[PDB]
Symmetry: D3
């Protein structure tokens, strides 16, 4: 169908959850969905489709970096007609305003990537989510009692930064954490008139060097699935 997704047309529901790690996505399908039938597995990048509280939901891994995320989100919108893309995952905090376990809602995605300048006249595309999803995440959060931290994130092309000295500046300008796909996902979705949002769970503070225990991490990530699926319904 498309070189990166194995599914037949109609295998995806119009709402889809996204993570870079497919084994993470396979863990969502099992612990949380009912029917759940693996629908794609090109390059071992798995996606699922199943039911949560009787409502249909799809899941899909997108890999690491803006370019990889862009590839999958583009095919999900144009070929599989996904209408809402809710990204979840881990991010390293850089701000004193957040700490371990927090869930960060990204109202904007800064970037050191060139992709949006190629996309957008060599100007500064402000990469933002769809507002009603952000609204929905806020409401669903409060309904569950989750202190949702809301700010920007910085999407970088480097996992191992060459500019760690710049983390303090990014925090000053209201970036609560660093990750690597939100700006690509946000730009792809504005390109293709789809509804996207990124949520991030704080498991490592790049500044206070604090970190959790591998069971607190599966604990925390579990607390994020619930909000993501409760808000897809």
């Amino acid at each position: 169908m498309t070189p990166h997704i194995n599914a037949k047309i109609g295998d995806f529901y119009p709402q889809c959850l996204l993570c870079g790690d497919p084994l993470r996505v396979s863990y969502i399908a099992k612990k949380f969905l009912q029917d759940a039938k693996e629908i794609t597995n090109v390059r071992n990048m798995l996606g699922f489709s199943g039911k949560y509280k009787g409502r249909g939901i799809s899941l899909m891994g997108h890999g690491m970096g803006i370019a990889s995320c862009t590839i999958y989100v583009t095919e999900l919108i144009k070929t599989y007609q996904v209408k809402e893309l809710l990204r979840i995952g881990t991010c390293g905090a850089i701000s004193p305003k957040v700490g371990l376990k927090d869930i960060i809602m990204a109202t904007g995605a800064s970037t050191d990537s060139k992709t949006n300048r190629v996309r957008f006249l060599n100007h500064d595309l402000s990469a933002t989510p769809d507002f009603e999803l952000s609204l929905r995440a806020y409401q669903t959060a409060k309904r569950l009692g989750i202190d949702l931290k809301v700010g920007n994130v910085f999407s970088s092309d480097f996992f191992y930064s060459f500019e760690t000295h710049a983390f303090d500046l990014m925090a000053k300008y209201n970036h609560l954490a660093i990750e690597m796909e939100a700006a690509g996902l946000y730009a792809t979705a504005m390109e293709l008139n789809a509804k996207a949002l990124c949520l991030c769970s704080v498991s490592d503070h790049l500044i206070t060097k604090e970190a959790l225990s591998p069971k607190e991490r599966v604990e925390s990530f579990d607390n994020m699935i619930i909000l993501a699926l409760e808000m897809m319904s």
Copy 2:
């Protein structure tokens, strides 16, 4: 006191509305506020303090362009301790889904300025508003029965654009109008850890219409004004 504002300490309330045009500021003061007082007039750039429905609120002009907007917003925060800034200005429409007098909430402000690359390590800063202010706008506008179209704007260094052939690309990327200040307001309020939000009344249609007169740019936007005043109550 500062080079651009001559108000006493404590003159400005912690909540302030902004327009580029100090005469629209004076118009709101005279027409909407009780006990209105002019508190600053440097360079003829008026600001005012008064009460709206029993509660104190300030109004300040900020001139035209990111540079000028940044000057006033920096001083409002650092010297005058203003904590919430709400811009209610004019813009030019670029999609057909918005009309001559429509109100836009800018969830993001793209730009062709170099100012954000200067502040932000030559990377792409996603200039964005405070989310809680976004929420307050959306719900109050719904409460009040005012149509509030929500999306990105593009903040340009140019009123008379050299890139009119790109309006459609911009509109495709969820930019509902063009103005000249949102990105600076947003960037400065991120730098100084303050809450900012931009609302926009269409005053020109860059495609399928013409333009309001100078007098019309002052008096034709009372719904925006009232949305703003009601948000700060």
Copy 3:
């Protein structure tokens, strides 16, 4: 007949003296012109026409920053058929070749703005004044006894710079002072085949923080005004 000027064509003489501050424009009309009449006042941005030594001269405020200056200058030329633009204003000395009270003629205007790159093929536009005007400044300064300093200025998008460590380099390359509109005035007049020249008064030192007494501030600005009007008689 434009959104930022409510004068009629013909109201502006073909040579206009420009200042960022419209109250300063008001002072000049009152003190130095005969028969001065306010001709525009949108956004409180005053402009006047009157006479000096029997010669018709217009005054117009242009606000702060290249974007604001570009707007007014574009409208003055394209609608109001102004052919000679002579800008005065204050500047912050960065170089040892000048001291407080000096009048600087800017033969070059560097910038941190992206506008000239947008205007000019993404290359480096050398923004420069009209040479005939520059000869008129020089011969008039000689007649009047003014020791006219000549060099480049740097036109910044920031009043509160994020690059103060750079002022020595800037000064090394023959930048005598920092201001905020020169590059935009020069570039707009090159685009539109008009004659333009910027003169600046050194009111304080960005590098020593020494500043002019209020009395010295008015006196040096008056000297500059007299030079401009004499230039245009």
Copy 4:
């Protein structure tokens, strides 16, 4: 022992083969390698150590994109002591000098990414492979009677290009095909004083539209698999 690789130190041979798809990596292990064990599997990104004609060969998938490829290559070098990195994979031809089933050796990787400007002082990093490895590809191919195509490639952040009009210019400048990783691999190997080369098989022509992705793939994929192991032998 690294965020993205499961193996134990000493599990990787110093020579390693790389493909974006871990399923082609897994393929080579079970069709070409003697005594093949799965040394890593984080995020379903598999790696293998085995013997080929008795000699020590490792295999590792690097994901899709410059940022995905950079993470892995960085960890293989800096942690698992890999010294020679031979990437093989697919590309879309854009040059008339090559057709499908052709194999391309990238003497240079050009890029639309910003990562190398960020690595390399905002200048033009000419991302090249190690000449030794390139000498061994030309000799091995000549021995195996493989008609090797030798020129630059273009490493893009976009699989779905927004600049398809640019393909003729790249061709004229000796760019034989487009892929998404070589410029990252090459700069990461340059940063880390390692040896890398990239090899490319034409699976589709982007200009002439011709395509070969259902059966003739693994026919010529295997022809490139043999070249790679034979030059590592």
Copy 5:
């Protein structure tokens, strides 16, 4: 003495005339100077010292390109104590405001080089001549009956341009001709606090296609030479 000049110290007079062609420089020496004497000859790049109407001047060849020009101008200033640098040469006209046989004074040199952004903070350096030298050139041409055309030149890295379709836009922004060194000569002079000026003779019109007959070419150059020599007198 320096890598590119082998004059002895004191061999160069503080006023030096420049050209890209060492043989045109030789032409000026033989035919206009008394007590003429070749003083340097590294790389076949000649420089001379002689006397014109009792006043000693020097001539130097500088090559083609900003890179080349910068090298010789840096050494001329820092080692051979040269204070005043006057480049004369040809240029291809692009503006209808200039015709064949016109001499152009470049009050600004725009550029497509990156050298000035490298020197200047990644900002825009408006490269300009020394005003007092420009003034002297105007005074001399007026004495000599020469109508000096004054405006900008565009100094390009390309003789065979890839952007000829842009010449109209350049001409519109007051660029009168295209050459190759002026922006470098101006930036070096500003960096090193020396007085420079570039004069320009029009032997070809890049768009009208008008051209001088080779016998008009010597006539034409000779007018510039006398002007240039007359103003160092």
Copy 6:
């Protein structure tokens, strides 16, 4: 015949040996070629045809800097039918893998010039030599017993650099030495479907600061010549 080359069509063999100093070109002709004929001399830029071991070979000087180089290389290929170009000269070493007397072969030429961004879509053009020439050089080296050092070089627009603090980082990324033309040679050849390669001999090491003597300089250079003529034998 071209504005910069004085030869007739067919005055060049299709293999040319390039150096920036035309006096080193002429030195080569006297001491190494049989019956060398001077075939051009415009701008004192000498070129020659001659024989070496019964083989027709050409020599051409090209000046300093990418801009000068690109001029001559373009005319050589487009007008004078040169298909193979080999550049030799000095270069200042920066990497601790090379030392005095070493000969470096450039498999990539990085740069701080904008010329390749202009040529190549504001992206990164990996400026690389032709592979057959690089093999022929490597093989000729082995037969002559020369220890060919192989890596990137950095072509700068500056002889007197403003980023000497950056040289270590260049070395780290496999940049062996700095020169001033290689990136322009390679880019023009890639533009014009021609084959080119650069080799440079280390005279000075810009890091540790050691320098050959002008008798050691002559022998060291003679050694490179013999290499270059032998590969074009």
